[PDB]
Assembly symmetry: C6
């Protein structure tokens, strides 16, 4: 992370203990655990430098997952670059004519950044760290994604709430665009729930358009 | 949370460890545990940004409970908006003519806030964070509520204090308006306690109008 | 708690972890445990706001004990009000003519304090927080008191020191005014201890007037 | 403890957790444990106010031990008062004519100190806190002392080092004036050690006058 | 580590607890554990002085491993010296004519540095600490390396991902120059994987040139 | 330890918890454990006052070991005094004519230092604390030393690395002057290792003069 000191931007390493701690969480709970995800997001709540993210991931992830994270990160950074190239006002760009970002800077490979977190802190702009961090985080999620919702049905002894949570987690972790998730989830609620639930949802008000709204409606009738 | 730095308002993430810790508390103790409630309230003792609350809840709550929290939060925020719309002096509103709050700001979706906790800290007013935080907390309580007081009776081997606590917890977690809770609780004490207790309470002074007052009176006579 | 910042008095929440921790202590050790008492006193060593004390107690205490604490606190606050009303120079009062304290302020219910720890910090005076805190603490002790010294006698296989500690704890936790405790304890030492101890104490110097003095005298003769 | 803030001396409570922690140490390890002693000394390394010491001891000690501590503390404070009365330049005294210390101040009972750690911090001088703290600590040691060295002999299967440590601990915890301890310990080494050790020590250089010097000499010959 | 204070650069020791903690990690998990490596890297994220690194390594490593670390460090420092000697603009050199670094300074043996972390902090330049730290870290990796990839083949019941991670770890820990690792790893994927995987990789696009790219391609087809 | 505050040098006690922690380490792991040594060195990384060192050692060491530490410390301090007496420019001496150090100051017994860590902090010079600390540390090592390398031979089922580490630890903990350790260790490698190792070392390059160099050479041939 970076903190503004008297002379200027300075590098401050992530606490070694939290890194080790997360490494354990990843190992004990798995990449797809809400605990892990929450902890990783927490550690990445403060803008990180390339040096921070690569060493963080290298440590908490296995050799293979780290290799996957690196490819995912590269792709994510490239999408940032494509956007920053198309829009001069992109926050990753500097205000000045010669301040557009590039892939070398985002990876901390540009002149004066190579293997130097202090130089990265001194040269990268706040907007670049935001992109670097969000990119690294998304890359982590992709790795966790790659670490079927359409076959999920409410079991005869399974409660609605358990089926709803199971189904929602599968859809949110799927390849669907986010905008398709709510309609897809509600369709599965209407079609794949047990007979009594299917009748509750059938006659629900037509204004209930989110999964949470439908869940409340059903739970209120149990 | 937000801290006022030299240049102005800045975002400071909630400690990752406390978030993970609460996630465990929720998982091990349950949503309706006084331990959980106490810990959540503690973590939400400092005004939070939309970014803080959504990521906090997404992490400590399961997919389903989080979907419920989101719907509850939306409702709570809307009640804030309704109040801020009716009263220009509402603390969530800015002093200036074009400073009334709106749902987009409270959700951190307004221009310059989207997915940016730093921008949220720079743009949201203290009063808006208070509303955002209180709203998020109430939404959490609602989720815990949805995670019967009228059938509770003092068992033949059950102590009064245990029946009183059991009954009070059921009434406080019920759908009654808060103003009805004390009269309802005292009525149940008078009618549903064991015969000896019913006689103690029968002749209690008419000035004892709270559950705590009646409990003391009974305990003093044991 | 309150800390004086640049702009003025500001609210700082009690650490969520210590609150949870105390909740555990109360649950595992009990209200009448010296461990609990010590920990509660420690947490209440810094002046607290109404918001701090009510949420602290609501969390660490069960529904019933909390209802009892609330009644006890009300009584304690009223005694403060009675004193502040009788003596204009009472520390809970402000120096100015219109600065006497009242029950609404002490409960954080006065204009601008309702459900707002920041406003409470900005409006309550240091002396009011002292009273609020001492009152809350005393209320806690009362609850622990209500959660017999006259029948305590030294058992035939019980050591004097154990009987002395047992007896002293019972007398200190009793309804006696504090000024009666030392004479009552020493009387019990003289009358209810085993025959050999009764003879040691019989001929003790007449200048030994505290329980600790008599204990030392006896222990010195063992 | 006291910290000098902008407006002046201010009270800062001892960390509740360390107090609870020590209470456990006292309970689990005992008063005469080097662990306890070390921890207590550590907690009392920073000058404490009357409020700090009494509440610290009340919490970590049982009712009886606390009553003993209070008597011991009173005696210790009186010795400080006797010294400060005889020597105007005593550090517990203020530089000014009307600044001699007295027992009421040291106990935090003087005008403006009663039950008020903030007032104690504002009124007590640094030298008074030093005396209050050293006195409280000595009182703790006395309590631990009261919680035989002359019969200790080296057992036939006991090593010299173990006998030496056993003996030294008994002599240091005894009623001997500190100046008598070294000669007494060395006499016991010469007379009460096993035959082979008695011969080693017999012909030791006459310049070895401390227990540590004699121990080294013996260990060097094993 | 070094922190810039008012008077200038000052030495601040690494937290004793993290050092002890890492010592345990090394002992319990081993030198070649990603946990250890991550923790060591974390502790060495802040520029260290010779005093910091030697005492850190002496403590966390056994006598033999420490002797190996010392030889490795010497070699690493010499490579730094060779580079700083060939390039006057090397960051380890001072801007002034008489400010080139030398082995004595890097080892903290130069005039005023010997056994004095405060003097080292006052005399060594930021660039020298960077070199000292990176050198110490590389020396640690070498020790871990010395604490076969060509025989690794995917087992008949072994998953591709497990074989890929196993193989990648062996190649990264090998004597190959880093530039040879990716081609060597991909060759092993093509030749030493199970028959079905060999067919997947055979017809992969010719643009997939990293191990991570090939892994993704295969995983996408499982 | 000492920290420079506004008014000047001030005493800050070592954290009670780390002291207790080390006491446990000493008790559980022993004085000759690399864990203990590392932890003690860590705690003594910041210049300590006489008050700090004596109370630190008194707490973490048993009565006997502490008595030994005190004698060792006295000897170490005297060597410092001998050096500071012979060289006026010795860092333990003040720049002024009447600023040479003496044993009373180093032990914190000089006027104004007796039993007063605050006075010690105000009167002792930085160089004196360095000497006091290094002396205390060396005294600790001596105690650990006194808490045979010539008979060590590589066992028939013992690996070279294990024999090398065993031997090196024995030689480093011996009475040899440090300058004799490397030649003595290498001689033992050549003469007391198993036959195959003896042949590896026999024909080693004549430039390999440290134990680490020879170890690497052997390990490279295994």
């Amino acid at each position: 992370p970076v903190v503004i000191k008297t002379e200027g931007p300075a590098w401050t390493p992530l606490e070694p203990k939290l890194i080790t701690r997360l490494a354990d969480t990843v190992r004990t709970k798995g990449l797809r655990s809400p605990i892990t995800m929450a902890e990783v997001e927490a550690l990445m709540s403060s803008p990180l430098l390339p040096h921070d993210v690569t060493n963080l991931m290298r440590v908490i992830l296995g050799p293979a997952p780290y290799a996957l994270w690196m490819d995912a990160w590269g792709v994510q950074l490239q999408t940032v670059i494509a956007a920053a190239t198309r829009d001069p006002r992109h926050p990753a760009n500097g205000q000045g004519r010669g301040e557009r970002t590039n892939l070398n800077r985002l990876k901390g490979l540009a002149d004066g950044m190579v293997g130097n977190p202090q130089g990265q802190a001194a040269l990268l702009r706040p907007g670049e760290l935001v992109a670097i961090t969000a990119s690294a985080l998304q890359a982590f999620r992709e790795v966790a994604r790659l670490a079927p919702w359409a076959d999920i049905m409410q079991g005869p002894s399974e409660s609605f709430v358990d089926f709803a949570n199971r189904l929602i987690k599968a859809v949110e972790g799927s390849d669907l665009p986010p905008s398709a998730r709510a309609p897809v989830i509600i369709d599965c609620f209407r079609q794949k729930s047990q007979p009594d639930i299917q009748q509750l949802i059938r006659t629900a008000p037509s204004t209930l358009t989110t999964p949470g709204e439908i869940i409340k409606y059903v739970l209120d009738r149990q």
